């Protein structure tokens with residue numbers, strides 16, 4: 001019996017600090033029984049468990065892991081003979097601590113109306129979103145405008161509708177499954 | 192021929208003030224015979240040389256008025272032969288000093304669902320005699336008044352056993368032997384036991400390619416500290432939103448700025464109190480104009 005190809009449409013997502021959700025698209029059977037072999041492998045530590053789980057299921061939980069730890073998974077479709085391995089899917093587990101403050105803060109493109117701001121984040125804290133709290137510098141302090149960005153891929157955002165010749169105090173937070181960064185660094189921006 | 196009457200005991204002073212005095216005259220028991228049609232109450236300042244002042248006493252408890260402050264008076268009763276006499280024993284009393292003003296810098300802040308904290312300036316005593324602070328709190332929603340006496344020296348009270356989201360009008364004064372003037376009415380709301388109501392009268396207007404004003408209304412007394420206007424593009428991406436947290440609840444309008452032209456937006460609005468945020472029944476929709 002020739003070996004089957006690896007599972008089609010694989011994806012790995014953090015369920016929790018101690019678990020990962022391995023999702024994949026099911027396939028039509030050819031038994032003449034069959035199961036799916038899944039191995040996960042820690043990057044930071046030297047730990048490799050091998051799960052042999054039923055073939056007809058859609059997805060599997062990878063329980064008993066450590067927090068804030070990177071893992072690499074790959075799986076086969078085993079029948080009478082052993083199949084071929086999939087590509088290496090990588091995903092961190094959810095963080096057990098607060099994330100760091102974003103470095104390399106570059107404010108630019110200053111005009112009367114609009115402005116742009118740039119930042120960079122450290123990988124491996126499960127950063128779900130970042131917030132750019134900006135407000136007027138003076139002692140009035142009657143309001144602020146947070147702008148929460150739910151896509152971590154983004155590293156720039158253009159602010160719009162600022163009043164000309166006005167001093168704005170811009171802070172930048174970063175968020176995750178636990179909490180948020182606590183930076184003491186304020187950043188001025190005059191229009 | 193007969194035996195004329197006079198009381199056994201001196202008058203008793205029930206209550207006094209700088210201006211007035213209230214006195215049980217004690218016409219009974221008394222020596223002598225018969226009935227009494229009318230009776231006097233003689234009074235004057237102890238050592239001073241003028242005429243004794245007489246008032247006719249019908250009931251028993253009498254109210255002396257037009258007195259002088261800080262002066263020692265003496266009191267005695269006469270009874271007349273009826274139908275139409277020696278004066279009875281003497282009681283001395285001193286009228287009260289002048290009534291102090293109320294405490295300054297009165298500030299009533301709420302601190303819980305069931306408590307309010309009143310604070311005033313430390314007041315230095317002008318007079319020598321003793322003094323204390325009387326504090327009245329009065330519910331507006333329900334009929335509920337409570338009086339709290341507070342020592343003269345310390346400078347604040349915790350008004351407690353109050354109800355959640357109920358306003359109380361408060362006054363205070365400084366009492367001595369005499370009773371001082373009432374302060375101005377401080378008013379405040381106790382904290383909310385529930386989430387705040389959703390803001391009413393949400394009206395979007397002045398829509399533009401890069402602007403749109405939103406206006407709302409909020410019910411008073413739910414301890415609403417702030418409101419938040421959340422907006423995002425209606426597309427299924429949900430890549431980002433923008434919160435506009437307004438620090439004071441007095442503001443009822445906000446102009447959104449820097450919006451994308453020809454773009455559908457989803458506006459939500461939240462009131463915020465001591466507990467949390469108001470739950471919307473429904474979100475709001477707007478579409479920005481295109482340029483020309």
Ligand SMILES: *[C@@H]1O[C@H](CO)[C@@H](O[C@@H]2O[C@H](CO)[C@@H](O[C@@H]3O[C@H](CO)[C@@H](O)[C@H](O[C@H]4O[C@H](CO)[C@@H](O)[C@H](O)[C@@H]4O)[C@@H]3O)[C@H](O)[C@H]2NC(C)=O)[C@H](O)[C@H]1NC(C)=O
Pocket residue numbers: 308309310347348349
């Ligand atoms: C009713 O309201 C009044 C007014 O709010 C309230 O008075 C408060 O009482 C507290 C406690 O007696 C006092 O607080 C002081 O505040 C100073 C700074 O102004 C602090 O430094 C003092 O010490 C604190 O902070 C230190 C920090 O280094 C700590 O090391 C220390 O352990 C203390 O925590 C001090 O406490 C002050 O008189 C006011 N405070 C305020 C903020 O108004 C009154 O107590 C309320 N309640 C009642 C029942 O009257």
Ligand SMILES: *[C@@H]1O[C@H](CO)[C@@H](O[C@@H]2O[C@H](CO)[C@@H](O[C@@H]3O[C@H](CO)[C@@H](O)[C@H](O)[C@@H]3O)[C@H](O)[C@H]2NC(C)=O)[C@H](O)[C@H]1NC(C)=O
Pocket residue numbers: 013015021022023058059060061
């Ligand atoms: C982690 O893995 C679990 C199971 O190990 C995943 O369970 C799947 O969850 C989805 C909902 O996201 C469900 O799918 C359902 O499929 C039927 C048709 O088969 C459809 O009618 C439903 O509307 C729904 O889409 C279902 O509970 C389950 N999938 C299947 C095929 O049984 C779970 O999604 C994974 N969790 C995460 C966070 O990725």
Ligand SMILES: *[C@@H]1O[C@H](CO)[C@@H](O[C@@H]2O[C@H](CO)[C@@H](O)[C@H](O)[C@H]2NC(C)=O)[C@H](O)[C@H]1NC(C)=O
Pocket residue numbers: 215216217219220250251252
């Ligand atoms: C004014 O004072 C008189 C004398 O103290 C009061 O009469 C006494 O009242 C109490 C009971 O309330 C008892 O000591 C005696 O029963 C009373 N004694 C006499 C002699 O009557 C009286 O209460 C006061 N009068 C009024 C009208 O209030």
Ligand SMILES: *[C@@H]1O[C@H](CO)[C@@H](O)[C@H](O)[C@H]1NC(C)=O
Pocket residue numbers: 054056057
């Ligand atoms: C997958 O496997 C079992 C094998 O006994 C099968 O009976 C069952 O229908 C499947 N499980 C489901 C649909 O949850």
Ligand SMILES: *[C@@H]1O[C@H](CO)[C@@H](O)[C@H](O)[C@H]1NC(C)=O
Pocket residue numbers: 108109116
């Ligand atoms: C400034 O912003 C505009 C878009 O409004 C963009 O095309 C341009 O590249 C920006 N310039 C810099 C230096 O980032």
Ligand SMILES: *[C@@H]1O[C@H](CO)[C@@H](O)[C@H](O)[C@H]1NC(C)=O
Pocket residue numbers: 342344345
């Ligand atoms: C107020 O006077 C009382 C008298 O018993 C004393 O015990 C208390 O310490 C005084 N409070 C002050 C000075 O704050």
Ligand SMILES: *[C@@H]1O[C@H](CO)[C@@H](O)[C@H](O)[C@H]1NC(C)=O
Pocket residue numbers: 396397398399402403404
């Ligand atoms: C809407 O608000 C007032 C008129 O009611 C005006 O000052 C403002 O310019 C209007 N907004 C826009 C975007 O035109």
